[PDB]
Amino acid sequence: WKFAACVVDRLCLMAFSVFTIICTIGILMSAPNFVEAVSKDF
């Protein structure tokens, strides 16, 4: 039981990792002037 639970836990960890990175990137790359705002401020 425990090995199955650990590996499914790791699989879930993955799915959330990919979902999270893709979500943050897409939402902060959607803004029309976002690319210009970082080049100026940073």
Partner 1 sequence: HTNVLVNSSGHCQYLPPGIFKSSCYIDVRWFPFDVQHCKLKFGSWSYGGWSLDLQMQEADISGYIPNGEWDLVGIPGKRSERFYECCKEPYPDVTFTVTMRRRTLYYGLNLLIPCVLISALALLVFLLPADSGEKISLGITVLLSLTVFMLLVAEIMPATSDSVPLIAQYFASTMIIVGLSVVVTVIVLQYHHHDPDGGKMPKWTRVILLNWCAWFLR
Q: Is 32 in the site for partner 1 (CB under 8 A)?
A: yes
Contact status: 39 vs partner 1 (CB under 8 A): no
Are 34 and 28 in contact, with CB atoms under 8 Å apart?
yes
Give the count of residues interacting with partner 1 (CB under 8 A): 31
Helix%, strand%, coil% for the chain, nearest 5? 85, 0, 15
Query: Taking CB under 8 A as the rule, does residue 12 contact partner 1?
Result: yes
The secondary structure element, H or E, covering residue 32 is none
| Residues making contact with partner 1 (CB under 8 A) | 1-13, 16-17, 19-20, 23-24, 27-28, 30-34, 37-38, 40-42
